[PDB]
């Protein structure tokens, strides 16, 4: 079942040049209450990372003059050993993969309009936007 | 008149440890609004900041014309400035609003 997971995740990585950028040296990081991250928040220890790989237009690809665009992703990493409630950011989000060994509840497959989800403790989650 | 300005201008920097560190900075675009990322790379003419951090509010701008001005969180008390005329009147939280080719300041 794990060999199955690894296969799926590697595939996912290869499948999306959002997680593979040449020039980073676009992202937006988030708090528990679903807002952008001011200093202090950015400087104090955390147990929870939320962020969005925003944008798309990368240059290219490797062929003559053809720019692609990758879907936008939201990554939630909860290392806090306790359940926690997250406010999602703008748009529709769709759970593509997670560390939940358990089956996925219908209100966890798709989430919109900032409504909060009860994130389990020690859990990782990846969403793609679908609109707009 | 200008010497008596520079003397008093440099006097301020020769008076406060709030401008002598290795860094608590603020910041504030027009209007009233704490900085984001638009905004962070926008080729215009507006700068504001604060030191918490004896505390001080500092507003600075360029610029070809007047734009709305709103102070931020905390009490503001003037100390020095650039001026087309002189000081009047009496310029918590409100709206000023500032002029043109000019630069400005405040305290706590």
Proportion in β-strands of chain A: 35-45%
Number of DSSP-assigned strands of chain A: 10
Q: How many whole angstroms does the radius of gyration of chain A measure?
A: 16 Å
The greatest interface between two protein chains, and residues involved on each side, is: A-B, 3 and 3 residues
Specify the number of helices of chain A: 2
Name of the CATH class of chain A: Mainly Beta
Assembly state here?
A: part of a larger assembly
- The H/E string of chain A reads HEEEEEEEHEEE
* Number of spatially distinct domains of chain A: 1
- Residue share in helix of chain A: 10-25%
Straight-line N-to-C gap of chain A? 35 Å
Largest sheet of chain A: 6 strands, antiparallel
CATH architecture of chain A: Sandwich
Strand order, sheet with most strands of chain A? 1-2-5-10-7-8
Structural category of chain A is mainly beta
Walk me through the structure:
The structure is cut from a larger assembly and holds 2 copies of chain A. Chain A starts with a helix and ends with a strand. The first copy, chain A, contains 2 helices and 10 strands; from the N terminus they run αβββββββαβββ. In chain A, the strands form 3 sheets. In chain A, strands 1-2-5-10-7-8 form a 6-stranded antiparallel beta sheet. A two-stranded antiparallel sheet of chain A has the order 3-4. A two-stranded antiparallel sheet of chain A has the order 6-9. With 132 residues, chain A is mainly beta. The first copy, chain A, has a single domain (24-132), classed as Golgi alpha-mannosidase II (Immunoglobulin-like). At the A-B interface, loops of A face loops of B. The PDB classes it as hydrolase. The entry lists the keywords hydrolase, glycosidase, glycosyl hydrolase. Crystal structure of Glycogen Debranching enzyme TreX from Sulfolobus solfataricus. Chains A, B: glycogen operon protein glgx.
